[PDB]
């Protein structure tokens, strides 16, 4: 069922799959093994279905959070890097890919949202969310707007929802207590209420998604956006003098983005486990392999030490790390999927008015518990 003698790789369409395919063509020239990199839609969701019948790719790229539910279903193979290999990657990134004491993926890069702003429109970015309404009113009198970011994915609204005390699963005594969910406490209501109020006051539009926000910022129509380092590539080609900075505070407290480690898992049903190890270990996790991916769409801060040491002199990488340092590393427990689909419905319903903030978050909390 999965075909023997070639590597099929899945990676999400916002990452540098072209640069990854350049690593796969160096691999193919060298080994004779054909490598096809693909980016299907909803791939985080297609993988557990197809791979359960034992199908799907040999290697799946995603943030570590969805990988514990994959491992729990026994859909990921235990990777086998020797100690020499592990020492080239930061020890905390291995932690994100451990499940029941076993490494279940190769960590690639550490991702956090940042505030991206157009210095032409706004040379001094706002340090607080509370000053954003006024900022929009001034900018609209010039035919611009203050802020446009992707509201259809809770990943993007979570930093605000958690700033005042929202949380996913409380971390106590070295586990994630799965009956203690903080999506419906006073912090979560305050943060999501602020976002809803911005929409109600015409400062943002509730339908805005990733394409809409990305185009508005890159055509210089909005002053600010919130996005990861993969988005820097299209800003660079497109004329906007931009900066990358700390997320604005809410009620004095730092915005707390969920930090994701982009990771490579090996399908349990794959017959090419030994080849996937060769590609990931000796081709991708190279200075050259990561540069090939990085030149297509930036990775952020990377798990590989040798390459990170020249990536950290980049101001934007420092801002990414500070925003990451102020947030929380995502848990990889299997309940993460239910959490994300619950918060997603909660944010879309609250944003549009389909539900009040209080019962949208109350419904989100019953579904996680």
């Amino acid at each position, epitope marked *: 069922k999965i075909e023997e003698g070639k590597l099929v790789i899945w990676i999400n369409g916002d990452k540098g799959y072209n640069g990854l395919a350049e690593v796969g063509k160096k691999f193919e020239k060298d080994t004779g*093994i054909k490598v096809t990199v693909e980016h299907p839609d909803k791939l985080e969701e297609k993988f557990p279905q197809v791979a359960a019948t034992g199908d799907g790719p040999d290697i799946i790229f995603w943030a570590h959070d969805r990988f514990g539910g994959y491992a729990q279903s026994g859909l990921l193979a235990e990777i086998t890097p020797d100690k020499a290999f592990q020492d080239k990657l930061y020890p905390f990134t291995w932690d994100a890919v451990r499940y029941n004491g076993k490494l279940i993926a190769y960590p690639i890069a550490v991702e956090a949202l940042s505030l991206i702003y157009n210095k032409d429109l706004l040379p001094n970015p706002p340090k607080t969310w509370e000053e954003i309404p006024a900022l929009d009113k001034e900018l609209k009198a010039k035919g611009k707007s203050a802020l446009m970011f992707n509201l259809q994915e809770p990943y993007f609204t979570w930093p605000l929802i958690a700033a005042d005390g929202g949380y996913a699963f409380k971390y106590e005594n070295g586990k994630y207590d799965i009956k203690d969910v903080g999506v419906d406490n006073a912090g979560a209501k305050a943060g999501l209420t602020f976002l809803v109020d911005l929409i109600k006051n015409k400062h943002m539009n509730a339908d805005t998604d990733y394409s809409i926000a990305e185009a508005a910022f890159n055509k210089g129509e909005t002053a600010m956006t919130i996005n990861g380092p993969w988005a820097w590539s299209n800003i660079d080609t497109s004329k906007v003098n931009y900066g990358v900075t700390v997320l604005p505070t809410f009620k004095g407290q730092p915005s707390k983005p969920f930090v994701g480690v982009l990771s490579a898992g090996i399908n349990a049903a794959s017959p090419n486990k030994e080849l996937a190890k060769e590609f990931l270990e000796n081709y991708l996790l190279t200075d050259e392999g990561l540069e090939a991916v990085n030149k297509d769409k930036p990775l952020g801060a990377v798990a590989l030490k040798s390459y990170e040491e020249e990536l950290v002199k980049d101001p934007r990488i420092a801002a990414t790390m500070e925003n990451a340092q102020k947030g929380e590393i995502m848990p990889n427990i299997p309940q993460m999927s239910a959490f994300w689909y619950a918060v997603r419905t909660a944010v879309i319903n609250a944003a549009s008015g389909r539900q009040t903030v209080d019962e949208a978050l109350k419904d989100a909390q019953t579904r996680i518990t």
Partner: single-chain antibody
Amino acid sequence: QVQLQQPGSELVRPGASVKLSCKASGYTFTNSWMHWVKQRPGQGLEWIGNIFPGNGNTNYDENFKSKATLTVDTSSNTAYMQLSSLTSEDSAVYYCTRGLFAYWGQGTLVTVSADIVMTQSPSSLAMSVGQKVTMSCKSSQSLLINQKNYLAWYQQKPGQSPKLLVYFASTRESGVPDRFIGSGSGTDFTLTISSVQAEDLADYFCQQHFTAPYTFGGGTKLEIK
């Protein structure tokens, strides 16, 4: 760091057999396909067959089924080619090459004494240093899958093995001067030397990597004044 040690030469006679050895170092021997290529004076290069050392799978060209047998010793990182029933016409330099004909051993000369067509042009050419050199290679079938043209270019200086210059039509190999530029797609491909130098005297082959027999072109014998 990658090396493919082959013995310099074997002296053999008709009806006998010889076992040719290829010693691989500097890479993971189990995960790379290994090809064997024959180069007879007066004939271009033809693929004999290949071995995947990790599971021992083999594929043979028709002219070497029942003439060649390929084997591996996992533990010594050595590939073997057995030639049976030798005849005068089997006198050639025999190469082992790794991957998509990416690195070549230096070749063993054996002396027996006592579907896809690749049209390369011009077959020989004489240019002066500094001039622009254009070599074309036309394939009887598209070599595109989509992106990705299964076509490479090689430089063979006299008495040396072929050395990969450009792979996948346009990607210059590591170490190659930037004067070498491959271009093209589908069936028409070009190798351009933007400004030749004297060191560039060599024989230039294109080779398709789409499917067996991974056929080579007739070559461009390039000389520099």
